[PDB]
Amino acid sequence: SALVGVIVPDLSNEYYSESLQTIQQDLKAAGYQMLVAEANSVQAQDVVMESLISIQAAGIIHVPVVGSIAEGIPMVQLTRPGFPRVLCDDEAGFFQLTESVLGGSGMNIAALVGEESLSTTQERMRGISHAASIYGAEVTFHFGHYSVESGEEMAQVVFNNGLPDALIVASPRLMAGVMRAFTRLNVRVPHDVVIGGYDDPEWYSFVGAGITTFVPPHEEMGKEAVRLLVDLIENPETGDVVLQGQVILRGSSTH
Template identity: 25%
Template sequence: MDDVAKLAGVSISTVSHVVNETRAVAVSTRARVLAAIESTGYTGNAIARSLVTGGTKSIGVAMSLLANPHLAELIHAIEAEATRAGYTILLGDTLDSPDGERDAVRKLQARRVDGMLLTPAPGDTATLEQLARTGVPAVLVDRVSHKVKLDQVGPENIQSTSALVSHLAAAGHRRIAFISGVEWMVASEERTLGYRLGLGRAGLRWDSNLVAGGGASHEDGVLALRRLLTVPERPTAVITGNGAMTAGAVREATAHGLRIGEDLAIVGHDEVEWAELVRPSITTMAHPVDEIGRTAVRLLLDRLNDREHAPRTVLLPPRLIHRESCGCDRTAASG
């Protein structure tokens, strides 16, 4: 900073005000300081600055690098919103396991992040409860929980799943099956509720034989549809809980010689990059991944500014992308 100040012909405090944006500086003076910074390669010392300000202007992001198919899009949205607010992000891989999550959170806290964005690992409430109990500013992203008092943002699941049922029922389907997700996830419970709601709205009877699941992988989709196809009066349409299980269902239907969109309609939650590439193309309920990431950052910044307000849950509506696998008129309106 001393070298920058001498080169720009200003005081060290002026350099500090320019770097930390703690006070207005004349445009010409600011330009000289920035030019001097560029010339000297000065980067500042975030750790030293944190000892003075009490913050590092950094956000920890704890997520699974393998379990989230939309991770790149989500991280891009988070980083763009964080950068706009003057923050950097540090990423920790939770491995989608309780132990991995605890380790990632601990390492991010050791880096003195100001707050944390977290996609909870299956079955781990201990880490979430500790964050809530110790008052660490944190936001749950994509996977919400009713068990902890933390800010959170994710997709709306009840009405969107009901809309998928309504879409299929409007095409004449009366045996609509549902492949649900992991049992512990709130999203799975909500989508099952939305499925039942949609059946009721369409005047269709609930049949437990038409519900299978308890997983989230490609193989789970294969096994679930395999079981559903053994039902005496088998389904003519299937709704899946995520993109991986949609792929599994498509694979299993094809293995049985079924024509997707004709013998069996398949629609699913999560937009996947291959949905438009296969034939028939796949009708999906696309989650607003970009807006989820940006909203997560905004919630965290609000929490950093006011740590006393009640935790908020934001549910963002997905969008139906109408393609061919539902077997109905593609020109119909889709939300």
């Protein structure tokens, strides 16, 4: 087959769709056609995997789910030993992001993050905690899902308990929820709270004086995932590549 399957947790999520365009272009140039599947659970991923094995696909680029084991098929893991991975430096990125919202000591930060057990969450937490420690700030982590509903819920909790000086939000979907709740509660950004976010959907540029954000290198990650998979197909038997994103400074993080 000149066929490569790409498995993502969620097609509607803007985070995963950004890389797909650059993945497809680079797969086409290599002589491969891209088919995308969506799998958020073990059974869904198991069914997708055996579908791609039955087609006899040339390779698989995927975002793995906990509890799943894939065999005899070149495979590159995205975002998170037997297979090469392409990762983002989330620790360093959330370190810098947290530093950008902090100006002084004796300050409070609330960090809205995902499921605690994910290695990605652990990396982000380590960055946030380190920046908060060195600046003499204290962080409270709230664990949710990457969804607008979770975002709205956690932002309402944060408001009711007395707003912190700073908010770190580890997802654009959580960020949309935060902004929905803050508009409803007349919370002014950056007047009442400074905010740091993740990724860069277009709307970041035109709310909260511009959302200061850590942006992972989506295009580079896709190129590198294709580059590594093509190398795995041609040269049968390599490790992880960790790429640096950038913090874009805007109005939300300062007074």
